[PDB]
Design a protein around this ligand. Structure first.
Ligand SMILES: CCCCCCO[C@@H]1O[C@H](CO)[C@H](O)[C@H](O)[C@H]1O[C@@H]1O[C@@H](C)[C@@H](O)[C@@H](O)[C@@H]1O
Ligand SMILES: CCCCCCO[C@@H]1O[C@H](CO)[C@H](O)[C@H](O)[C@H]1O[C@@H]1O[C@@H](C)[C@@H](O)[C@@H](O)[C@@H]1O
Lengths: 270, 270
């Protein structure tokens, strides 16, 4: 189809940020063009997920549905971080897709995701993949999540806050925290449950967030929303090159199916 | 200002291509955010312009107006390619801005711009700058042209064709030419008068267009619109990471001031 210059791709939502990063909604991309571009580079995507304690029960539906909807036709390597490696379900994968189990050994728990993704992103990952994506396990894919998301650095608009003014955002507001964001600053509220980028940019974001959380621990402070607060401070200073709409992170029981969402792609399990 | 997710930046035009490249119009960017990002990398922009035979008369207004509107506050190096090096006017430049004169020595004339930018982009340029931009001299800046344009590779929508269907585009249509584009292919018609990118991507585009034009010369064919036809074939296969709207390349005597143009930034001299 010919793009039409004098017809907006969307009339109801912002599709580009003020620093010229695309905000990814249905209707803004031609997946066949993008699929070609990324297949020409033999793109490999690493997906990291933590499944700790009773959350290992969510892995079966998470993986089954990732096989139906996540990066189908591209190279995918899943990295499952778990305290129960023997409890990872044996899900059959499509060609070009592999899964590795990485065993994990309260503020240390809070720092775990950034610390562990940082250590891992400098090892295995760094050889094994082009992009890394971090998501939570208590979720299911219901629709396409593909190479439209890939870029050097991305965050995802939090589904509770996309229509909120910045004063309402639940940033860390105590100047004593490394995650501090003043009341007059901030572009969006990004959710900790879906972020990613190139392996280099994920190394940088996770090192910065881990090192920031350690400084806060030394000072006796825990940011209001833990590594999400540090994610938002990082993405305020280092602006993402794409932003995913809440199509990519939704809770239907909580929030229904608003008119602005043409697809619910990755959703909370109720 | 807080971006508002539920308000389109523009209701009247497409602001992102189907491969998720921004189309740059007024209202789509916050120049203060972009200026900061680019100043943090001490960005240097090379501007190339050819002024041959009687076209040297256009250099005075071109440079005077570039000093008022082009990349003010960033590092700029102008490279003036001319057969009359002694006829380049002595225009006073702002701080951080320099100008070099490069002397140039009918199908060879047609290949000149791509051949010469290719040779130059592998030398001087390659040390001296982060991005190269190629424009024509018979033009004036009337409004801001800044770092919003910078990206690995960009083309500019031709002001005569932005509202046209692809069949009407004046691509090279003879299969015998390296510039050939079939009747059912094509995203936009880009104009030869304003393109650019990182030095690496400009090296690649100019080498590819020069080598394509030489193959056509060997075969006794000249593409319908010369290096513009090769530019459009190149940008069809190697999609630009930003596209400039016709704000950036306009002819007011020919085309007036349509409602969709909030600014006329770089215009033909009548
Ligand atoms: C009854 C719970 C409704 C909470 C809505 C706000 O979501 C929470 O927002 C904070 C930041 O203010 C954190 O991001 C937190 O993780 C969010 O809660 C989780 O996500 C929402 C959408 C919903 O799925 C909750 O059940 C989750 O606990
Ligand atoms: C009376 C001239 C009107 C021509 C309009 C179309 O512009 C020309 O388009 C071809 C491709 O079809 C080339 O891009 C050519 O360089 C264009 O002409 C130049 O640009 C237009 C906008 C106008 O400024 C002309 O005077 C130029 O010759």
């Amino acid at each position: 189809p010919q793009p039409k210059v004098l017809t907006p791709s969307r009339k109801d939502v912002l599709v580009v940020t003020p620093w010229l990063a695309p905000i990814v909604w249905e209707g803004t991309f031609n997946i066949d063009i993008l699929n070609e571009q990324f297949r020409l580079q033999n793109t490999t995507i690493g997906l990291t997920v933590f499944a700790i304690k009773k959350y290992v029960a969510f892995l079966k539906l998470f993986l089954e549905t990732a096989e139906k909807h996540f990066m189908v036709g591209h190279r995918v390597h899943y990295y499952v971080f778990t305290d129960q490696p023997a409890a990872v379900p044996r899900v059959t994968l499509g060609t070009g897709r592999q899964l590795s189990v990485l065993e994990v050994g309260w503020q240390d728990v809070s720092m775990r995701r950034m610390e562990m993704i940082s250590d891992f992103s400098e090892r295995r990952f760094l050889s094994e993949v082009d992009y890394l994506v971090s998501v939570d396990v208590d979720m299911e894919f219901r629709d396409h999540v593909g190479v439209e998301i890939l870029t050097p650095l991305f965050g995802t608009l939090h589904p509770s806050f996309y229509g909120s003014s910045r004063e309402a955002f639940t940033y860390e507001r105590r100047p004593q925290s490394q995650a501090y964001i003043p009341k007059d600053e901030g572009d969006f509220y990004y959710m900790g449950a879906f972020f990613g980028g190139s392996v280099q940019e994920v190394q940088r974001l996770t090192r910065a967030c881990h090192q920031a959380m350690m400084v806060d621990q030394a000072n006796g402070i825990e940011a209001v929303w833990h590594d999400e607060s540090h994610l938002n401070k990082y993405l305020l200073r280092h602006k993402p090159t794409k932003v995913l709409s809440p199509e990519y992170l939704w809770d239907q029981q909580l929030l229904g199916w608003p008119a602005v969402l043409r697809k619910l792609r990755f959703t909370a399990v109720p």
